Design a protein around this motif. Sequence first.
Motif, PDB file in Angstrom:
ATOM      1  N   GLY A 208      52.182 105.638  28.512  1.00  0.00           N
ATOM      2  CA  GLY A 208      53.269 106.154  29.322  1.00  0.00           C
ATOM      3  C   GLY A 208      52.917 107.396  30.112  1.00  0.00           C
ATOM      4  O   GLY A 208      53.560 107.681  31.126  1.00  0.00           O
ATOM      5  N   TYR A 209      51.915 108.148  29.654  1.00  0.00           N
ATOM      6  CA  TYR A 209      51.502 109.363  30.364  1.00  0.00           C
ATOM      7  C   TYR A 209      49.990 109.618  30.428  1.00  0.00           C
ATOM      8  O   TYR A 209      49.553 110.750  30.650  1.00  0.00           O
TER       9      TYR A 209
ATOM     10  N   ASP B 165      50.673 107.824  22.436  1.00  0.00           N
ATOM     11  CA  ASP B 165      51.052 107.100  23.639  1.00  0.00           C
ATOM     12  C   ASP B 165      50.737 105.606  23.535  1.00  0.00           C
ATOM     13  O   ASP B 165      49.771 105.115  24.106  1.00  0.00           O
TER      14      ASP B 165
ATOM     15  N   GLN C 157      55.667 107.470  22.025  1.00  0.00           N
ATOM     16  CA  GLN C 157      55.284 108.303  23.145  1.00  0.00           C
ATOM     17  C   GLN C 157      55.776 109.698  22.793  1.00  0.00           C
ATOM     18  O   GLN C 157      56.876 110.097  23.186  1.00  0.00           O
TER      19      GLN C 157
ATOM     20  N   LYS D  88      58.259 112.219  28.149  1.00  0.00           N
ATOM     21  CA  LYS D  88      58.756 111.374  29.229  1.00  0.00           C
ATOM     22  C   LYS D  88      57.573 110.810  30.000  1.00  0.00           C
ATOM     23  O   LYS D  88      56.484 111.374  29.953  1.00  0.00           O
ATOM     24  N   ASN D  89      57.784 109.699  30.701  1.00  0.00           N
ATOM     25  CA  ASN D  89      56.709 109.066  31.457  1.00  0.00           C
ATOM     26  C   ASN D  89      56.126 109.891  32.582  1.00  0.00           C
ATOM     27  O   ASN D  89      56.799 110.744  33.174  1.00  0.00           O
TER      28      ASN D  89
END
Length: 536
Positions: free
Chosen positions: A8-9, A475, A362, A527-528
């Motif tokens: 996601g990141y 993640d 995540q 958060k993404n």
Amino acid sequence: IEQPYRTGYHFQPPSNWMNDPNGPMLYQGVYHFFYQYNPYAATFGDVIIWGHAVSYDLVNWIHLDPAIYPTQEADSKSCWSGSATILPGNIPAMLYTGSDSKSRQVQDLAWPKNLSDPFLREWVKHPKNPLITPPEGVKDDCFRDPSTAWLGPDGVWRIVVGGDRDNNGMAFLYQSTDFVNWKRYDQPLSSADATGTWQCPDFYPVPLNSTNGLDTSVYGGSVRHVMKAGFEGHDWYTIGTYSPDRENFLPQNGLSLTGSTLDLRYDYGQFYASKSFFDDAKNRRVLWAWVPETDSQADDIEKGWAGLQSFPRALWIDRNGKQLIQWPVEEIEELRQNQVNLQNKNLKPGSVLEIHGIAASQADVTISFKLEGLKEAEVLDTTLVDPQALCNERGASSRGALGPFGLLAMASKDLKEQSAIFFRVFQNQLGRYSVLMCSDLSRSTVRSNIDTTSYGAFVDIDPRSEEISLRNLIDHSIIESFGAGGKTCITSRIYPKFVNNEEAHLFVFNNGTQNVKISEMSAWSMKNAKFVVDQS
Ligand SMILES: *[C@@H]1O[C@H](CO)[C@@H](O[C@@H]2O[C@H](CO)[C@@H](O[C@@H]3O[C@H](CO)[C@@H](O)[C@H](O[C@@H]4O[C@H](CO)[C@@H](O)[C@H](O)[C@@H]4O)[C@@H]3O)[C@H](O)[C@H]2NC(C)=O)[C@H](O)[C@H]1NC(C)=O
Ligand SMILES: OC[C@H]1O[C@@](CO)(OC[C@@]2(O[C@H]3O[C@H](CO)[C@@H](O)[C@H](O)[C@H]3O)O[C@H](CO)[C@@H](O)[C@@H]2O)[C@@H](O)[C@@H]1O
Ligand SMILES: *[C@@H]1O[C@H](CO)[C@@H](O[C@H]2O[C@H](CO)[C@@H](O)[C@H](O)[C@H]2NC(C)=O)[C@H](O)[C@H]1NC(C)=O
């Protein structure tokens, strides 16, 4: 839950195969990232080009079209790894290994064609390519990955190129004054017997008694140099002294690299082709690294992609100057959302405590343990012990005196599948303590044909006057573990099965026979990252 293994990141292309990070650099305010890419599959190919992406914070990226791809005979067959050097006059010069018509590995030059494009999209190549070809006794398939250059106080450029002579790996040193005509220096900057070809060599300075970075061209007494090279499957390094004049590098430990348990590594898990660059905008050195997939190739084709990039991390020498310290770049904190916190919580033996209200798949987790009864530490002299072997022998289920105590990331609600990142504390017959760090990927997944090898490393801290701390960037299919503030890093790739339907969980646990108190632990749901695609 579509694509349950995509991060996601963490950086990764929209799809397909990606490996070696390429020519990282900060230019005119834009962070440029490049990467070995196969535009046609989730598998290495005959045609590898340079992927391109830009960012203003190393977290959110804009995908661009490739920058370097075969357009000459000097690279007609493929464009492999290389490095970006920003020459005086502020012009980024890219040195990389190409596969020419006669399938040799040669060193080519390339620089931005439109230097007024903030994103440096179009790249032009030098007519004289290849600028360097395999020296006297080097095979045509054992000479590659030119490093970032450094300008000697004598105003002469220098670069190292991976390779080997008689399977004896080495960093071939070259010199130039115009960056186009390179002269090979008689001896290599560094060697190692029977290690095979040396890949992605990196050579840079690090300020002593400082946590900041230095441009590649700094020399001094308050400076030490790092000779990094990848061989035998890992990225090894050694801190030493560099004399551009005498042109020799003397490792501090007075030992030539081996790839034995005696040498240092950036990371001790899935971590390859690592390459750093200087961020003059924040005076720091950032390290990029390829984190290969650990599932089957069939799996890769299936999900449609392969390869990830470790989250960019800051790099600096430890206060004692014996090893390097890494930490995720601060910008990552911008992705933090809500936080869950624990303090002064005691983990009794055989415990498992669940962290609630976190995006367990995540997240960013930091925990710090306060040990009870070091006296009872199991007796084991770890002088010649191989931590990876040990972590594989003793998993999370192997109860001990002090340890295993740590985390259970990407775990099932019922712990059928779990990835345990933990510590163990031992002592030799002389009462001296050693701390072991593990990543028990053994029970990480119930799926078959998935590499579940566990990784391990000793952490250099005195548990007798320091709380053992651990930080995890979780993640989805990758977990990056930072033991003791960056002294010991372990990157893991996990593919649990449950992710396909149910959600993941986060647990803190103690399976030792001794008590461990969580002095404090903090978790944030991440958060993404934003990845806009500007291609066509
Ligand atoms: C920085 O980099 C380049 C300068 O060094 C430059 O790239 C070129 O950009 C032009 C315009 O975008 C590209 O031109 C294309 O030409 C084909 C020709 O068929 C067309 O697809 C289209 O042009 C159209 O065709 C007609 C004649 O041009 C006309 O009827 C239409 O209105 C239209 O113009 C494309 O625009 C050219 O191929 C690019 N070359 C490359 C790959 O470098 C960047 O734009 C420049 N950017 C900046 C200022 O940062
Ligand atoms: O992508 C090129 C880039 O990767 C490095 C490793 O970081 O190795 C390139 C290399 O091996 C790759 O290709 C083979 C199949 O030919 C694959 O099995 C392997 O896993 C890959 O890493 O490619 C050449 C041959 O084309 C080999 O000399 C080398 O092992 C790095 O050296 C290079 O810059
Ligand atoms: C804590 O240690 C115990 C001791 O073994 C673990 O017990 C499990 O051992 C096997 C897993 O490797 C399996 O047989 C069962 O899961 C269970 N069986 C036993 C011996 O009781 C336990 O799983 C460990 N805690 C965790 C989940 O890390």
